[PDB]
Enzyme design. Structure first.
Site, mmCIF file in Angstrom:
data_model
loop_
_atom_site.group_PDB
_atom_site.id
_atom_site.type_symbol
_atom_site.label_atom_id
_atom_site.label_comp_id
_atom_site.label_asym_id
_atom_site.label_seq_id
_atom_site.Cartn_x
_atom_site.Cartn_y
_atom_site.Cartn_z
ATOM 1 N N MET A 114 23.876 12.133 13.577
ATOM 2 C CA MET A 114 24.112 13.304 14.016
ATOM 3 C C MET A 114 24.697 14.797 13.329
ATOM 4 S SD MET A 114 26.684 10.019 15.796
ATOM 5 C CE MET A 114 28.096 9.875 14.952
ATOM 6 N N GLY A 115 24.336 14.699 12.461
ATOM 7 C CA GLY A 115 24.135 16.494 12.354
ATOM 8 C C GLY A 115 25.353 16.078 11.006
ATOM 9 N N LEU B 166 24.964 16.708 7.699
ATOM 10 C CA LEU B 166 24.709 16.042 7.165
ATOM 11 C C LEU B 166 24.755 16.047 5.846
ATOM 12 C CD1 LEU B 166 20.332 17.315 8.624
ATOM 13 C CD2 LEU B 166 21.747 15.281 9.180
ATOM 14 N N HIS B 167 24.417 14.923 4.402
ATOM 15 C CA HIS B 167 24.693 14.623 3.095
ATOM 16 C C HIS B 167 23.497 13.901 2.842
ATOM 17 C CE1 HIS B 167 25.844 10.898 4.246
ATOM 18 N NE2 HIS B 167 26.840 11.270 4.868
ATOM 19 N N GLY C 190 22.942 11.190 1.802
ATOM 20 C CA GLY C 190 22.774 9.456 2.438
ATOM 21 C C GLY C 190 21.625 9.854 3.411
ATOM 22 N N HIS C 191 22.167 11.142 4.414
ATOM 23 C CA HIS C 191 20.861 11.541 5.497
ATOM 24 C C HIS C 191 19.420 11.828 4.831
ATOM 25 C CE1 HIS C 191 25.277 12.572 6.865
ATOM 26 N NE2 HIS C 191 24.376 11.464 8.083
ATOM 27 N N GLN D 13 28.281 6.633 22.576
ATOM 28 C CA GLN D 13 29.122 5.646 20.758
ATOM 29 C C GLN D 13 30.430 6.079 20.541
ATOM 30 O OE1 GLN D 13 25.708 6.746 18.574
ATOM 31 N NE2 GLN D 13 26.863 6.582 16.970
ATOM 32 N N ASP E 175 23.769 25.243 9.395
ATOM 33 C CA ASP E 175 23.469 24.386 8.182
ATOM 34 C C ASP E 175 23.214 22.820 7.066
ATOM 35 O OD1 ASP E 175 25.383 22.291 5.763
ATOM 36 O OD2 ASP E 175 25.409 23.986 4.996
ATOM 37 N N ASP E 176 22.904 22.872 8.906
ATOM 38 C CA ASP E 176 21.879 21.156 8.390
ATOM 39 C C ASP E 176 20.582 21.476 8.830
ATOM 40 O OD1 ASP E 176 24.543 19.558 9.259
ATOM 41 O OD2 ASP E 176 24.716 19.492 10.936
ATOM 42 N N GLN F 177 19.526 22.411 4.969
ATOM 43 C CA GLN F 177 18.924 21.899 4.584
ATOM 44 C C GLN F 177 17.880 20.901 4.694
ATOM 45 O OE1 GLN F 177 22.513 18.966 3.130
ATOM 46 N NE2 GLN F 177 23.501 20.111 4.926
ATOM 47 N N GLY G 7 20.085 4.480 7.813
ATOM 48 C CA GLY G 7 20.519 3.872 6.118
ATOM 49 C C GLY G 7 21.342 2.575 6.089
ATOM 50 N N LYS H 152 23.509 1.870 4.896
ATOM 51 C CA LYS H 152 24.721 1.817 5.232
ATOM 52 C C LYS H 152 25.972 1.470 6.620
ATOM 53 C CE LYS H 152 28.585 4.663 4.214
ATOM 54 N NZ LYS H 152 29.748 3.659 5.401
ATOM 55 N N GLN I 136 23.986 -1.670 12.275
ATOM 56 C CA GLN I 136 23.725 -0.907 13.177
ATOM 57 C C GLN I 136 22.750 -0.759 13.126
ATOM 58 O OE1 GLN I 136 24.281 2.856 14.391
ATOM 59 N NE2 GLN I 136 22.448 3.905 12.616
ATOM 60 N N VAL J 268 23.154 5.479 0.036
ATOM 61 C CA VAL J 268 23.735 6.405 -1.184
ATOM 62 C C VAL J 268 25.136 6.601 -1.734
ATOM 63 C CG1 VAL J 268 23.218 9.037 -1.785
ATOM 64 C CG2 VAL J 268 21.813 8.059 -0.522
ATOM 65 N N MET K 107 28.363 6.929 0.221
ATOM 66 C CA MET K 107 28.508 8.287 1.226
ATOM 67 C C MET K 107 28.734 8.452 2.639
ATOM 68 S SD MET K 107 25.790 11.263 -1.070
ATOM 69 C CE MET K 107 26.183 11.205 -2.894
ATOM 70 N N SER K 108 29.734 9.221 2.610
ATOM 71 C CA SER K 108 30.141 9.043 4.559
ATOM 72 C C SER K 108 31.065 10.806 4.350
ATOM 73 C CB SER K 108 30.900 8.184 4.371
ATOM 74 O OG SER K 108 31.617 8.686 5.772
ATOM 75 N N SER K 109 30.296 11.219 5.258
ATOM 76 C CA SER K 109 31.656 12.631 6.041
ATOM 77 C C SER K 109 32.720 12.047 6.047
ATOM 78 C CB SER K 109 30.976 13.344 7.379
ATOM 79 O OG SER K 109 30.491 12.459 7.887
ATOM 80 N N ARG K 110 33.059 11.326 5.765
ATOM 81 C CA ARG K 110 35.229 10.598 6.390
ATOM 82 C C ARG K 110 35.308 10.931 5.204
ATOM 83 N NH1 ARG K 110 35.196 5.205 10.498
ATOM 84 N NH2 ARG K 110 33.257 6.314 11.868
HETATM 85 N N1 LIG Z 1 25.350 7.312 2.333
HETATM 86 C C1 LIG Z 1 24.344 6.628 3.329
HETATM 87 N N2 LIG Z 1 23.505 5.970 2.246
HETATM 88 C C2 LIG Z 1 22.570 5.602 2.691
HETATM 89 N N3 LIG Z 1 22.585 6.092 5.090
HETATM 90 C C3 LIG Z 1 23.023 7.032 5.501
HETATM 91 C C4 LIG Z 1 24.868 7.190 4.197
HETATM 92 N N4 LIG Z 1 24.996 8.009 5.241
HETATM 93 C C5 LIG Z 1 24.554 8.123 6.601
HETATM 94 N N5 LIG Z 1 22.977 7.011 6.273
HETATM 95 C C6 LIG Z 1 22.517 7.258 7.242
HETATM 96 O O1 LIG Z 1 22.574 8.469 8.323
HETATM 97 C C7 LIG Z 1 21.869 7.821 9.828
HETATM 98 C C8 LIG Z 1 22.752 8.809 10.483
HETATM 99 O O2 LIG Z 1 24.178 8.811 10.652
HETATM 100 P P1 LIG Z 1 25.308 9.583 11.181
HETATM 101 O O3 LIG Z 1 24.586 10.742 10.848
HETATM 102 O O4 LIG Z 1 26.494 9.107 10.691
HETATM 103 O O5 LIG Z 1 24.307 8.793 12.143
HETATM 104 C C9 LIG Z 1 22.547 6.535 9.908
HETATM 105 O O6 LIG Z 1 20.736 5.508 9.870
HETATM 106 C C10 LIG Z 1 23.374 6.084 8.626
HETATM 107 O O7 LIG Z 1 23.132 4.982 8.392
#
Ligand SMILES: Nc1ncnc2c1ncn2[C@@H]1O[C@H](COP(=O)(O)O)[C@@H](O)[C@H]1O
Ligand SMILES: Nc1ncnc2c1ncn2[C@@H]1O[C@H](COP(=O)(O)O)[C@@H](O)[C@H]1O
Lengths: 288, 277
Positions: free
Chosen positions: B39-40, B42-43, B45-46, B71, B77-78, B81, B147, B149, B153, B176, B184-187
């Site tokens: 969902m963009g 990106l960090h 983890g992605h 959902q 920037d994405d 990357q 992930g 993570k 899902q 990650v 890691m999370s954008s949150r």
């Molecule tokens: N810290 C992380 N480590 C591994 N995968 C991740 C991490 N954060 C997000 N993802 C994966 O990246 C994908 C996109 O996540 P999102 O952009 O949050 O939908 C999903 O498959 C996530 O589970």
């Protein structure tokens, strides 16, 4: 790949077997045609087979599977006619090279888990009182499309609401398959062919001509408008001994949230004794 | 015609038909198409999913960026990357292109979707599986990467693939983590300093549990609970030990411990493999 004998009928029960064979055919340039049925084959089914056959370079896969998920409990599933030997004989006579005859356990190894939820069209007409019927249909068809991966999939206009819902499935899930609608095959008097016609006794068989007579009367009456078309159909149905109409509706051709204009579909369902019959026809309003 | 494709460069497509046509064409030229749904925003983890996809010999990597309304944004920037990672395709569709007829046919998940994250968000996974099925059919990848993570899902996507007989390999990529273990999370950036310090308890509780597990399931769960109990302002929504398919935990064997908690208004998740005994 298991055995494939070209120019002969090959019968596969295992999803993996037919999937492998289909892939192998597709990789060598044959176009794979899929014809989903519930067996008890008749000339209506054979019109779909022939339509598939005439696609240049086609290999034809006819699936036969009395899908439990599209049956509501109460013995409908046990009561569905099964004539496997006649079905395979007909397929051989037609030059079909693949019959796919999966078991229940192979299609539903995990029971009902992930399923397809159809849009609001599934709650109407046939779905009104059978609110899970089209989820059953769309779930099995999705699975069949994924197993076989045909270039084209063939459905009868006979089950027009089903046909529309399959087009919705294909559109909404971005499926890379062409849906081909095939015109309804009728007996000499107009009776739409169906595996359930065998449940009409002589008298009911005679009375049942009224559905197609009503529809075709309506199609012609429609130069004079929707009301004239509907009342023509009702008059024929009313004249018919022991036909109990469930519904008779004129809708836009997509059956969707769009009012009827110039092009419509007139759909009827009626009970003759315990047998429920369906029919439908193209209608053009104000058009001769 | 097939849309233009420039090998070695980031090729961006917004129309599903276009990325579909390109993917097909590339498949036929001897590439293996890898799909990474995001969902963009990106960090790293992605990027781990990206790198896993890249390493597959003959891979061409498709990264989807789509914020799925069903959902429930740094586009340039994405994209920079992805360019940096050597990704060749980004698929950036509009909501209208993904849903030209609105919400009509959808996917209905099994009962696992009502559990765990399905608690507060009962419609969430229907949205996820609907959008993932569509991306699968548009792109037709050999492998699709998710992930660990979002473990629930991931498991639900395996169920989708199995139940609908989809011909794609589902690859789970390990979580990650930041230096102290926080997933890691954008949150994470919403956390104030106290909350960020407290947030280390999720990963600390899981790893403690993983090592406590030699003494059995209850010792693992109690260990995790004790670490969560040592943190202030961490409201645990659940802490559950399940088998790796998220069914009930077997007596011994492999499982997964999952946790979710609220710190102020920010909801955090984490999970870990557990071997019992
Ligand atoms: N810290 C992380 N480590 C591994 N995968 C991740 C991490 N954060 C997000 N993802 C994966 O990246 C994908 C996109 O996540 P999102 O952009 O949050 O939908 C999903 O498959 C996530 O589970
Ligand atoms: N009389 C008919 N004319 C054209 N197609 C038919 C007829 N009867 C059944 N079909 C089609 O054949 C397929 C299998 O039908 P069934 O086995 O009755 O579920 C469906 O696509 C039907 O619409």
């Amino acid at each position: 790949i298991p055995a494939f004998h070209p120019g002969e009928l090959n019968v596969y029960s295992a999803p993996g077997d037919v999937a492998d064979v289909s892939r192998a055919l597709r990789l060598t340039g044959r176009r794979v045609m899929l014809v989903p049925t519930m067996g008890a084959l008749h000339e209506g089914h054979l019109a779909l087979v022939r339509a598939a056959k005439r696609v240049p370079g086609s290999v034809v896969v006819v699936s036969i599977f009395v899908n439990p998920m599209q049956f509501g409990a109460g013995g409908d599933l046990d009561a569905y006619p099964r004539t496997p030997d006649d079905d395979l004989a007909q397929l051989r006579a037609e030059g079909v090279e693949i019959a796919f005859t999966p078991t229940t356990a192979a299609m539903y190894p995990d029971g009902l888990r992930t399923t397809v939820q159809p849009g609001p069209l599934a709650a109407e007409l046939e779905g009104g009182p059978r609110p899970t019927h089209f989820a059953g249909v769309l779930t099995v068809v999705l699975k069949l499309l994924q197993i076989v991966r045909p270039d084209r999939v063939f459905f009868g206009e006979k089950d027009y609401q089903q046909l529309v819902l399959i087009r919705q499935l294909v559109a909404d899930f971005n499926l890379d398959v062409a849906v081909v609608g095939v015109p309804t095959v009728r007996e000499a008097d107009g009776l739409a062919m169906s595996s359930r016609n065998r449940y009409l006794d002589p008298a009911q068989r005679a009375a049942a001509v009224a559905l197609s007579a009503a529809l075709t009367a309506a199609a012609h009456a429609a130069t004079a408008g929707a009301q004239a078309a509907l009342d023509a159909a009702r008059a024929v149905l009313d004249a018919a001994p022991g036909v109990a109409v469930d519904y008779l509706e004129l809708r836009d051709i997509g059956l969707g949230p769009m009012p009827l204009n110039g092009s419509g579909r007139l759909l009827v369902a009626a009970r003759l004794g315990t047998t429920r019959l369906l029919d439908n026809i193209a209608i053009e309003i104000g058009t001769f």
